[PDB]
Write an enzyme that holds these catalytic residues in place. Structure first.
Site, PDB file in Angstrom:
ATOM      1  N   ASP A 154       0.825  -1.207   0.000  1.00 22.43           N
ATOM      2  CA  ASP A 154       0.000   0.000   0.000  1.00 22.43           C
ATOM      3  C   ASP A 154       0.861   1.260   0.000  1.00 22.43           C
ATOM      4  OD1 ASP A 154       0.990  -0.156   2.575  1.00 22.43           O
ATOM      5  OD2 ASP A 154      -0.927  -0.753   3.459  1.00 22.43           O
ATOM      6  N   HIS A 213      -4.649  -3.422   5.972  1.00 19.02           N
ATOM      7  CA  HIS A 213      -4.418  -3.594   4.541  1.00 19.02           C
ATOM      8  C   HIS A 213      -5.727  -3.924   3.838  1.00 19.02           C
ATOM      9  CE1 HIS A 213      -1.409  -5.136   1.256  1.00 19.02           C
ATOM     10  NE2 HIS A 213      -2.248  -4.222   0.807  1.00 19.02           N
ATOM     11  N   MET A 268       2.809  -7.918  -5.836  1.00 22.45           N
ATOM     12  CA  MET A 268       2.879  -8.429  -4.473  1.00 22.45           C
ATOM     13  C   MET A 268       4.198  -9.149  -4.227  1.00 22.45           C
ATOM     14  SD  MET A 268       0.677  -9.111  -1.634  1.00 22.45           S
ATOM     15  CE  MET A 268      -0.947  -9.708  -2.097  1.00 22.45           C
TER      16      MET A 268
END
Lengths: 252, 323, 323, 323, 323, 254
Positions: free
Chosen positions: E159, E185, E235
């Site tokens: 984030d 998150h 990710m």
């Protein structure tokens, strides 16, 4: 022979200071000065007599003991100059020379010693040569004439003066030390080995083994044997050197 | 953890070496700067540089030189690597034979003082009379009582750097990272093995001037400065690289292969030579053979062997007191 | 392809900075060295490093110092960046430091001839006193008729490094990369902004002394050296880092943020100050405001501006006195 | 300033290739993706990672393949690097005859469409039957009317990676960073060159096994996967490294010497081979001779060149049949 | 000295992560893999890369995953870092809570096995809905009695990564390395902090949309590729870029500050939140206070605290009614 | 085993099944089994009782021993599947399912669901097949359809407790606990000595934040799972610790 008792030939010692060895003379002077080691004369004579035979460790102690009780004598302040110049204490040698000059033949000698201290050659030898011309005697400084020149990478010139200092007094072991190292600096190993064996035999012969011939300064004399070991590599003799008998091979 | 210690930092080379090591050392390392005159300056001059984690200690000098200085003795506690770079810079117009004596004496005193507290630490020589000085360090280590035959190195990377720079200049745009160099270090014992690198070499009789240059470069630098100093930067940079290689090998983060001047065992009868080795977690671990060479360089290698034999003999037989 | 050209590469802020500069430039560059004495002695030492792709050239300086030396005039062709560091007395041996007119004259005499052949280059001022020298450089550039308000840079990064190191030394393990510093490049006229870094700050009692210690650095380093020189290596590091930022900016490879003592261009009454900027391509592009300011540092900034205006007035008055 | 136009980046290898390329490319580089399905998704997924001055662009085809689609022609302007990873899933490739037909068509169509508008870029083929796909690319480039011998390369660097690790696994702790490989890219038509590596080589008994492992290393990874995929990650790493080497050579920041399956102007009998070449500002700058080799490798070269000639003959015979 | 273990090397979230770890991990490390299926396929594809000093170990799993799989033990022995990455991502339908019901048990045993064989290793979590799975892992660990508060982390760097990319894309050219983000998150739990970065800020109206874009990025990503697969590469780029930090923190070469979603331990009312924390040799050493906040940040934090409390309640309280 | 001293505990186990907790009936069956290791019926009833007492670990072993005595028993095979399904021994659950289908992992679950669909098609009215289908959907994490399967199961034979509770369990995992709650009571109406329904109701309380009710019902379940003579228990101590620890995590909530 752990005993310290020796006769008192002070007259004989001062007579043999030029016509005999400096090892027996040193033992006799130590014997005659061991009675009352506090006066200026005994200490200064002891220092001057240990100047020849290399035992500078005790010689420095004796000279300092002489100096601490008399800041006026011209000899005690002069002997410390050369001996400290050889080993170490650069500043102490300069301070000693200043004190020696601050209490008023050997002026040129002191100048050349001071120059020799800070790695200055080819000119200190000049000062010595101009000094020795005025007084072509007292072979004690003739050694310098060679020594300060022998380490300047000029061996052939250094030899002559050495023999000149040899004839006056054979017991001045410094001259044979210098000729031995000069011979070693030619890759002619036997010429140096023979001389160094002769030097140690003469400095330890006579009455030296008797009366505690195990002086600590002699340690600094034993290691000098294990210099050319690299070209005497035989297991029979390398192990024998740690005891310093010299009976094996008896120099011949 | 790791703590490099440079002996002599206020010279024309110590300051540059310390500055270079102050920009590559791993986090959490430590420096220890000692010098007779000028230690406080470098101390509170490199401490005002931002490189987090690195601590910079120092030990000041003393009066005019005295053997067995207590400050160095107390400083040298807990050290892993010693970098001996303390020596007389250069004499105004005197060849190398005169320069030998003072450097031999000072290196003997320094090694004797340093090895008495941390024998396990490695020693790296970066003086100048290399060939004839490394045996002096070996003799001192044998005399004191402790001597590791796998922790002692003489820096010789500078000649390799010169050789690779010249060959890269003559063969642009082709690029080679390293060039082997074997022999001693002083003037002619150096020989480069140009036949052992990839890529087509240009031509014979054109490498002859290169081989002369890689041997006359030091005197060329001295001439260019008009006899008022030596190469104080180029040798200040290679030493940093070699010290970092040694430290990194000690930390276990790399296993490099490097050309150095180390004591032999097995191979060529000379006790010391500049032969390729490999580093590791504990000193040297595998000495390597010279490999296939040509007769043209084989004769040069034999002549270099002949020269280094006498060089090592003189270094071992110096033993000069004269009084 | 950049052609960085150091000026006066034979001093303490010379050789060291040059060595730091050599092993950082991108492949395919070209140095240029010059000084009145010692140019070949440092050019030779850099023509031996193994690194390829970077060439080294040098010019010799006439003697005794002449005006409009044609040597540098022939070296200054095709240059893109100038690093003026020449002309330093470095405490020539007197307790009274005056006659800064010597430095002023020896900076104008070379900056005018450098600009006469490279109009649109990018300058850097490292010679003291930046505060006054910089306006002298601006006036000299104005005299010729070709001046740019974007391509003039003054090096103040040394005090930033000092402040960042001093604040890192007291909070562990928290680490910050940099700390803003504004004001001049001098005594208390320099003020660091501690109210812009992340994490909690120490109380004012130890903050005031930390802020004080940043101001006293020249004295801090000189008093340890007993008057023999001053801090040398730190200035070289600051100059090296700044010139790296500038060179990377001229290629368009990076647009970093720096703290340059440069003109203001209608944002403060004082024509010059140390205002944070971003370089980018084509010199400085955007000027940034100082931002939030604590009341405690407001009067310090006021005093800083009050001293900077007087210093600028002095520099301009002396410049107008001569042609 | 530079452009890299990845093609077919939504496949298996393509994802890792794009991920590796985007995170390490220098400042100011544009990455233009493309695929048949899933390209917009991966393109969007490559705009959430932090970077400085790295723009991302993409296009998208249609579910039914179309000859010379306008979408691809909208991303072929101002592009210099054409790393192609488009291929075919392994499972619907049971018979090698069918796999050759399907890959050749897509390769020729993609290269034709790409080069129809920008006949100055460089292509790096990374499909699968390289030794057979590369002559197809050469033939179609010749057919389009414009061709450049030193602006067409094929990925064969993988064999170097495979060989380098295996020697390090056996010979310890000696570490080498490269090892030459000469021949094609078939399972058997390769020849490692272990006579050009410094250090003591092992006995030939283990050398034969080591060569065998490299000649079969492609199969066991497929067997362990039970007919699923074909060595995806390793070819991605090899292609990324080769492409970045090409990019840095084009940018003029390095002059690299690499092994790539290229065309030969007469240095060897085979029309196409894999020999060391030197890149530069205009692609391949200088070719290199193979170098001295031993008897067993001298025995391997005959069959190597024979099968390479057979493969290129098959490729050129397939050509001209549907152009 | 260091050994990491990746749990799950079949999906796109595990393969790229391992590939990026292997090419970056320090020298002399050991990498351990694991997966129910496909373990040989990657353990054979990653053993052919030319990085020296890396040893790859693996142990494939079993059909119908049984409890305490014997493959996990004898493999997770002597491992310093675990990264729980296993777990199927979002699929059409199958609301947020359902995925939680799917994943917790999959995590639970996968943490139970690794705890006994090494009650000193640090843990990392990468799979969504990490906001809720971290309490599940804590509950699993505390049942044995080897729960350490300083060696449990939740990877949420993505984030802040996105926010940094957005803000950089905005105030260009003005580069910023990182921007603080607190909270969880989830969609409405992440609170960015744009009031602490240096430099000016744009109008409030645009800043509202800039903040809004951060919280829902995965939504337009899945809308872009709703077919199959949502986001795996980016990710992955998070986890590697996080893992090295911890790895270095174990070695002692860096003590950085990170924004991992960690245990507050009384620093805030909520049991778990993302706070700026500093990593040392033993793990968590100091927690940095959040510092000053502006107007809208107060409301966002106040609502996020309640939402995160609800998530924790829906998390750590798990029963699995057991039909 | 407290029932070893009783020479005829088979009638004790048969009679006590309905009147009080199943725990000591299971111990009576254990006494029969240790005294008659050859009777299939004793081991079958022991396994069913252990499944009733919510102890899946011992039930699996008891039913395996029964299967060795008789590899074609019906109730032995069926109770194996649910215990294996709860223990996540998937392959064991599949072999138990195929054994039950014979006594009368994408591909494996597909095969099992096809087998169940084929069996249900030829036997539209059979509670056991629908129960097996619901349990398979429990393995499939598809609890909505399992709810309808058990709703039909509690309709054809609405006079029993077990299947009723199963329905609530499907609602328990779906975060719809209130409705199943009354169904729980309904099951508790049919049989007040079924610890599983109290366990599910405690889960419901935990879901809807009824900490006091959850704690008291967990304590009641612990008390009823000890058999009333906990010092004489055999297999209760094996897993009940976790149940005890369950209450601990429950107090960690409050």
């Amino acid at each position: 022979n752990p005993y310290m008792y020796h006769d008192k030939p002070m007259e004989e010692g001062i007579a043999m200071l030029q016509l005999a060895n400096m090892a027996e003379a040193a033992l006799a002077f130590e014997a005659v000065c061991q009675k009352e080691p506090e006066n200026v004369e005994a200490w200064r004579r002891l220092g001057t007599t240990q100047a020849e035979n290399e035992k500078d460790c005790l010689a420095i102690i004796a000279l300092n003991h002489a100096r601490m009780l008399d800041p006026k004598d011209i000899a005690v302040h002069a002997a410390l100059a050369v001996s400290h110049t050889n080993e170490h204490n650069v500043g102490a040698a300069l301070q000693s020379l200043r004190s020696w000059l601050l209490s008023q033949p050997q002026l040129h000698a002191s100048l050349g010693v001071l120059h020799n201290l800070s790695h200055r050659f080819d000119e200190a030898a000049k000062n010595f040569r101009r000094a020795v011309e005025l007084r072509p005697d007292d072979a004690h400084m003739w050694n310098k004439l060679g020594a300060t020149l022998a380490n300047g990478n000029r061996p052939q010139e250094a030899l002559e003066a050495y023999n000149r200092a040899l004839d006056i007094n054979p017991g001045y072991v410094r001259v044979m030390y210098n000729m031995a190292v000069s011979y070693s600096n030619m890759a002619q190993y036997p010429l140096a080995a023979k001389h160094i064996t002769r030097a140690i035999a003469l400095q330890a012969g006579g009455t030296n083994p008797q009366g505690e011939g195990s002086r600590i300064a002699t340690r600094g004399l034993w290691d000098l044997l294990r210099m050319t070991l690299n070209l005497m590599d035989r297991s029979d003799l390398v192990e024998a050197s740690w005891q310093q008998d010299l009976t094996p091979f008896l120099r011949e | 953890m790791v703590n490099v210690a440079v002996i002599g930092a206020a010279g024309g080379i110590g300051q540059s070496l310390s500055l270079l090591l102050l920009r590559e050392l791993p986090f959490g390392s430590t420096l220890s700067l000692y010098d007779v005159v000028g230690a406080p300056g470098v101390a509170a001059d490199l401490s005002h540089i931002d490189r987090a984690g690195i601590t910079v200690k120092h030990a000041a000098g003393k009066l005019p030189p005295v053997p067995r200085d207590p400050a160095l003795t107390e400083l040298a506690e807990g050290v892993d690597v010693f970098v001996i770079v303390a020596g007389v810079p250069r004499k105004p117009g005197m060849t190398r034979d005169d320069l030998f004596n003072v450097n031999a004496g000072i290196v003997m005193d320094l090694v004797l003082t340093c090895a008495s507290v941390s024998p396990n630490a490695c020693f790296c020589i970066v003086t100048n009379p290399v060939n004839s000085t490394t045996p002096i360090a070996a003799q001192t280590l044998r005399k004191i009582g402790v001597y590791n035959k796998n922790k002692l190195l003489g820096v010789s990377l500078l000649d390799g750097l010169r050789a690779t720079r010249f060959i890269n200049n003559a063969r642009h745009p082709l690029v080679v990272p390293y060039v082997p160099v074997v022999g001693g270090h002083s003037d002619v014992t150096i020989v480069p093995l140009y036949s052992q690198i990839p890529g087509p070499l240009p031509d014979e009789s054109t490498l002859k001037e290169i081989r002369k240059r890689v041997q006359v470069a030091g005197t060329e630098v001295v001439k260019a400065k008009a006899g008022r100093g030596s190469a104080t930067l180029s040798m200040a940079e290679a030493g940093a690289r070699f010290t970092m290689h040694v430290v990194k090998a000690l930390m276990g983060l790399d296993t490099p292969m490097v050309y150095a001047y180390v004591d032999t065992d097995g191979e060529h009868e000379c006790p010391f030579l500049a032969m390729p080795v490999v580093l590791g977690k504990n000193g040297i671990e595998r000495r390597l053979p010279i490999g296939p060479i040509t007769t043209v360089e084989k004769e040069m290698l034999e002549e270099a062997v002949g020269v280094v034999k006498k060089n090592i003999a003189k270094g071992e037989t110096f033993a000069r007191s004269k009084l």
